[PDB]
């Protein structure tokens, strides 16, 4: 059975990996469920604020959680993230006015920052082997991909069959189960300050080899962050595609991302992580360049797959290298070196929906896509400098 199997066994770090994966999955599912439901100082500032609130608050919160992780430990931030996510879901399930609908999203951002930073730091801390660290972060990063893949269908099946608040009243039970698992694994009631003080954030931010790794992730995710909302508008404007085609047009970019994140986590150590990131940046740039040449959805099928695959490669390559570099040239404390990675992640999702729309209004969708692709292509050779960073310790 399952009671006896868990009752009589040596608990492994795979339980920690499962906890991190589940937290990321639930956070991204909560993120993607609300977007189909949000439309329901007049629809110009309000909608943009609602979309950017969680990403902005997460980006602001990340450094504080990074320092607090060193100050007190990982399990307390992980449990706090679970609690804040549950409260945010319950607040979403009942609030109707705009102010509470914005407070809930900000709270979700805070909880997501706690969970992401603490989970990545703990995964780095317990898995100090390069190969194993790469594998486990590749597995854990698939949580975001699966969450964004299963979000909208999960929201839409219950938004009409049961009711308006059914998706949230169902996600709350999943969050509670995740909290129960965390209680079974961790001890969130004891402060465990880390043995050695980590390097200051400013010292890490002056590292040339860490800025390149962060910029790779930032510029890779920004492309898809701008492309996701701007694609349907151009699709309706040009190909007069129906309402059902808009949802399925972006399916390959998520399926391929889910596949690539899982496979390249283990495939990016046999060949160089620098080479994996270089090739991923080049591929995503070429695909984004080729997107605006599609006269119908069949043309859009393949570039989206390329974009998702390449973003998966660059993410799975640049997650372990953040942490490998801090082991190599700094103090082995991963609390505040993954706050930077999470900030790079969240910058795209905070900036894209507004800046991409403004640029598409100004010059157009093809020119915006060309700019994004050219930037991604030109940033690619900068990943060669991570081939052999000097130890210098």
């Amino acid at each position, epitope marked *: 059975a399952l009671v006896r199997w868990l*009752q*009589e066994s*040596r*608990r*492994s*770090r795979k*339980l*920690i990996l499962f906890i991190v994966f589940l937290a990321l999955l639930l956070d991204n599912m909560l993120l993607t469920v609300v977007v189909p439901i949000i439309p329901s100082l007049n629809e110009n500032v309000q909608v943009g604020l609602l979309f950017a609130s969680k990403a902005t608050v997460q980006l602001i919160t990340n450094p504080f959680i990074g320092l607090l992780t060193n100050r007190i*430990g*990982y*399990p307390i931030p992980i449990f706090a993230g679970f609690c804040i996510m549950f409260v945010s879901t319950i607040m979403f399930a009942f609030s109707s006015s705009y102010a509470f609908l914005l407070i809930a999203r900000s709270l979700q951002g805070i909880g997501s920052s706690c969970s992401s930073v603490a989970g990545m730091g703990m995964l780095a801390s*317990v*898995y*100090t*082997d390069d190969e*194993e660290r790469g594998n486990v972060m590749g597995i854990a990063l698939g949580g975001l991909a699966m969450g964004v893949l299963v979000g909208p269908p999960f929201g839409s099946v219950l938004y009409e069959f049961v009711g308006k608040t059914a998706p949230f009243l169902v996600l709350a039970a999943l969050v509670l189960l995740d909290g129960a698992i965390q209680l*079974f*694994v*961790l*001890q969130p009631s*004891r402060v*465990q300050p880390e043995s050695q003080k980590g390097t200051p954030l400013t010292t890490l931010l002056k590292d040339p080899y860490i800025l390149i790794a962060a910029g790779s992730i930032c510029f890779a995710n920004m492309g898809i962050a701008m492309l996701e909302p701007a694609l349907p508008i151009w699709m309706m404007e040009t190909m007069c595609s129906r309402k059902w085609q808009l949802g399925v047009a972006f399916l390959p970019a998520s399926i391929s991302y889910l596949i690539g994140t899982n496979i390249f986590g283990i495939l990016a150590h046999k060949m160089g992580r620098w080479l994996c990131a270089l090739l991923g940046m080049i591929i995503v740039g070429v695909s984004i360049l080729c997107i605006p040449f599609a006269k119908n959805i069949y043309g859009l099928i393949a570039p989206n797959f390329g974009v998702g695959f390449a973003i998966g490669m660059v993410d799975s390559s640049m997650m372990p290298i953040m942490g490998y570099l801090v082991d190599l040239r700094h103090v082995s404390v991963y609390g505040s070196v993954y706050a930077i990675a999470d900030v790079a992640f969240c910058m795209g999702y905070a900036i894209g929906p507004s800046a991409g729309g403004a640029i598409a209004k100004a010059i157009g969708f093809p020119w915006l896509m060309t700019i994004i692709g050219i930037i991604d292509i030109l940033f690619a050779p900068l990943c060669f400098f991570l081939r052999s960073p000097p130890a210098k310790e």
Partner: antibody
Amino acid sequence: EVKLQESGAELVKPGASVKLSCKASGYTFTSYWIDWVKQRPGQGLEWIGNIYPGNSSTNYNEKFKNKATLTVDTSSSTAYMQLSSLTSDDSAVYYCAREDYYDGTYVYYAMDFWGQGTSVTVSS
Amino acid sequence: DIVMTQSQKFMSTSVGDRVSITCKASQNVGTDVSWYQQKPGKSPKPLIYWASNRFTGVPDRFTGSRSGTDFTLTISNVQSEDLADYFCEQYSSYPLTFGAGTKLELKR
């Protein structure tokens, strides 16, 4: 001051049973697993089994399933291993160890504290 | 049952030298390996947990490495107190299997 106290030596006639003790002090007895291990002279260590003093949930090596029975006594905070139908092969040194968790978590990383051995000899 | 093979039962060294003890797994035990040291007349104590991490209070001489299914324990500056028995354990799957001993002895 975690301490696992074990009897110095035991003498048992062939075709008989013995019960080895491990008295645990200095910590909460019911919160950590207890491992029983065997070392023959000039041979490698063999893992006999595992027990949890809380719910008395045991893990047995299939080689030692019919030989060793692990029990606990939480009132006196002691762990017993009973070996039945002993023969000259069973003459070895038996160790009692405690499993430790990583900080803040419940995952196992090492067996920090080992009790001293018990030299069991089978002769007549 | 994974068999952790330790090739050498006896190793002869001298004070100040560097020594390495190898332990080879059988079925891809992934970093679920610990190293224990038993001094003459004492009970075993852990040195390396998770195949690379040093236990608290262990001197900086002892290092742990893994290359696939081979695990190495390295003592950089062998001293008089480092002459003892060393063995490897894996807990990847029950039954738990220990590697055979390896004794460090002086040279003359």
